[PDB]
Amino acid sequence: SGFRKMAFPSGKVEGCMVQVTCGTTTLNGLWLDDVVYCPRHVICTSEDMLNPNYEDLLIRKSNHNFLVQAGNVQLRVIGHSMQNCVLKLKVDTANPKTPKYKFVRIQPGQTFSVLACYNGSPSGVYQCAMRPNFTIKGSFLNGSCGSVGFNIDYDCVSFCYMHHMELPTGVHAGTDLEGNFYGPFVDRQTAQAAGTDTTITVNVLAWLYAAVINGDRWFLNRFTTTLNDFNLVAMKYNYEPLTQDHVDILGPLSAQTGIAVLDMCASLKELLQNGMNGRTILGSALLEDEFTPFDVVRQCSGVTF
Amino acid sequence: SGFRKMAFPSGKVEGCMVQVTCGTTTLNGLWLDDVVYCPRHVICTSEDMLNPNYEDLLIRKSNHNFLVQAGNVQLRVIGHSMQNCVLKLKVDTANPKTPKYKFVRIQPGQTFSVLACYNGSPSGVYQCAMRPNFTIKGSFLNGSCGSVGFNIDYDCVSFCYMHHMELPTGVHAGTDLEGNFYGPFVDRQTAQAAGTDTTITVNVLAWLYAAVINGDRWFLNRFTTTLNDFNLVAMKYNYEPLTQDHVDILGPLSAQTGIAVLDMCASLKELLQNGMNGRTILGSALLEDEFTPFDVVRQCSGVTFQ
Numbered sequence A: 001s002g003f004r005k006m007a008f009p010s011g012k013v014e015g016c017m018v019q020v021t022c023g024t025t026t027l028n029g030l031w032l033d034d035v036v037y038c039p040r041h042v043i044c045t046s047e048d049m050l051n052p053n054y055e056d057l058l059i060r061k062s063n064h065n066f067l068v069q070a071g072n073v074q075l076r077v078i079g080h081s082m083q084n085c086v087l088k089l090k091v092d093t094a095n096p097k098t099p100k101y102k103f104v105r106i107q108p109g110q111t112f113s114v115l116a117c118y119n120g121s122p123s124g125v126y127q128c129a130m131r132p133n134f135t136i137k138g139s140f141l142n143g144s145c146g147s148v149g150f151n152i153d154y155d156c157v158s159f160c161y162m163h164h165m166e167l168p169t170g171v172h173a174g175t176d177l178e179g180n181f182y183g184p185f186v187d188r189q190t191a192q193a194a195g196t197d198t199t200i201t202v203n204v205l206a207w208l209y210a211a212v213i214n215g216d217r218w219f220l221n222r223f224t225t226t227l228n229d230f231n232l233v234a235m236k237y238n239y240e241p242l243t244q245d246h247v248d249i250l251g252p253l254s255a256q257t258g259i260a261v262l263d264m265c266a267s268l269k270e271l272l273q274n275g276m277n278g279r280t281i282l283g284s285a286l287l288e289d290e291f292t293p294f295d296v297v298r299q300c301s302g303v304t305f
Numbered sequence B: 001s002g003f004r005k006m007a008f009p010s011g012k013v014e015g016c017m018v019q020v021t022c023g024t025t026t027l028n029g030l031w032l033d034d035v036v037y038c039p040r041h042v043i044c045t046s047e048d049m050l051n052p053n054y055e056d057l058l059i060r061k062s063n064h065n066f067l068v069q070a071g072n073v074q075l076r077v078i079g080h081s082m083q084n085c086v087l088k089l090k091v092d093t094a095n096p097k098t099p100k101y102k103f104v105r106i107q108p109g110q111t112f113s114v115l116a117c118y119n120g121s122p123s124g125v126y127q128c129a130m131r132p133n134f135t136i137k138g139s140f141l142n143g144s145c146g147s148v149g150f151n152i153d154y155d156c157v158s159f160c161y162m163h164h165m166e167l168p169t170g171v172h173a174g175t176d177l178e179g180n181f182y183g184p185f186v187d188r189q190t191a192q193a194a195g196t197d198t199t200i201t202v203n204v205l206a207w208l209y210a211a212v213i214n215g216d217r218w219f220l221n222r223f224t225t226t227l228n229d230f231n232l233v234a235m236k237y238n239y240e241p242l243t244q245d246h247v248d249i250l251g252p253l254s255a256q257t258g259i260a261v262l263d264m265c266a267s268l269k270e271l272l273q274n275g276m277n278g279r280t281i282l283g284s285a286l287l288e289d290e291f292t293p294f295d296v297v298r299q300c301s302g303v304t305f306q
């Protein structure tokens, strides 16, 4: 029993992190097979970052403009190219620690583990969610660019995020590993801001189920509701609309606990309208929305990798 | 910017986790060099749980009664010995993935990462703190026994916790890697219960300093306090006493932010009195006590957002 924010074991990803230097800029890269992936803004000076022409900046660069360091070993760069906002550096040595992996683009509301790295050295691991506004509330300092987010399914690492920048509110933005940004962001020093965020409703419901599984039941009541009536409450409180697909995904937890989704929706409806009355749920005074239904089942069932 | 519960990268520990089976019982062990460490209660049967005599149970075992599995490889046990509540199995193969490591016993309030494992296979990583009542608020299911807690400051793995059992309130008890329990607990099924727990005051203060570093000052006030007056008030909210050692430990964070330790104590006194009035601190609506001063320095910038 107990319930914690839990990350995937990070060992398979630790063995892929390297340091990439171009000029005076140093950040992190991901070394898979014989290619290193990193943010393309590594090639920019501070002058360039105000209005970069990445096409022209890269054609200027050559293989010898890039220094790749794996621990204490130098990797020789034998080619370079760009895919969207990601720079790809071909090296002469395949990473012998390359895990089984895929590149996957995730949806808002889905979670992943972040391995925060500095100078190519892993520093920490934590769990995040892709916010509805396509930011993540990470923990990153200068030099963290190129840190990656991932999920694991058995022995296969699904890479879904590469870190690129911090926004003025202190939240973070990045790309998938094919270099496509999550959210309406660009890799240049210009005026950019996170949009107004919303709460991930299906995840809050999942966490309420986790609370019931762990013995927290005070918020349950005799009432049920309908999607239409609940979604009018959701819009009132800047909660994401609850779809029929979400109801189906929560089906398992509904069957296990005896609280139909629309039964639990009646609990959440009341929590939004009345508050918590000084009480906590799973040790929180806020409604937590960064656990997915999958996260709850995994942690309450002990799945291993 | 940002502030998260952050665990250490777990790879160095992943390469040490193995499965240990004795009879019908399976749990996790920690394979370092040519020794596998695991809870000695792996040798308990159904009716040995109330009053086992581990010396009598172990003398009846042969090396081949212990099955150790490292992924797909069976490891041959060539000896065994008990150290307090830990069983040490000598195997014929040294772990080629053994990291630089040391065994440390920690004090209440200290934090560490936990690699939760089942059947010798890692499942997840999270951060914990040793509570004042010598339990941890973990996330552990059946078969998690033998999962370990650790820190990795400066490329050296300091193992500080091995998981043994769950208490009636759902919190968790275990030992250091020398097999000595944290707290008054024993590896028997007899009625034991965690004591009334308290809040780790020095950690709450560290986390308030983190909030200031990150750019938030709304909770400060114009007052100060004596150390004794602070403790008189804080103990009425079931906070642990703040000692001069704690005040000294907070010195560097006080210097970075310009807020005297006893001025931050005055802010905490007011937060306990008033609540947050709909606000949050570092994303929380409660006062968080599982970040240590050392943790805050590790994660936060060395430059305050003024």
Ligand SMILES: CC(C)(C)c1ccc(N(C(=O)c2c[nH]cn2)[C@@H](C(=O)NC2CCCCC2)c2cccnc2)cc1
Pocket: A001, B025, B026, B027, B041, B044, B049, B140, B141, B142, B143, B144, B145, B164, B165, B166, B167, B187, B188, B189
């Ligand atoms: C023999 C002894 C010391 C009484 C014991 C027995 C079982 C276990 N538990 C194993 O899961 C377990 C043991 N061997 C393989 N799995 C579990 C456990 O503590 N239930 C308690 C039930 C009440 C009485 C005390 C034990 C467990 C569950 C969840 C997370 N952590 C552990 C731990 C200790």
Ligand SMILES: [Cl-]
Pocket: A052, A053, A054, A055
């Ligand atoms: Cl461009």
Ligand SMILES: [Cl-]
Pocket: B105, B106, B107, B110
């Ligand atoms: Cl300590």
Ligand code: NA
Pocket: A220, A221, A222, A223, A224, A263, A264, A266, A267
């Ligand atoms: Na209901």
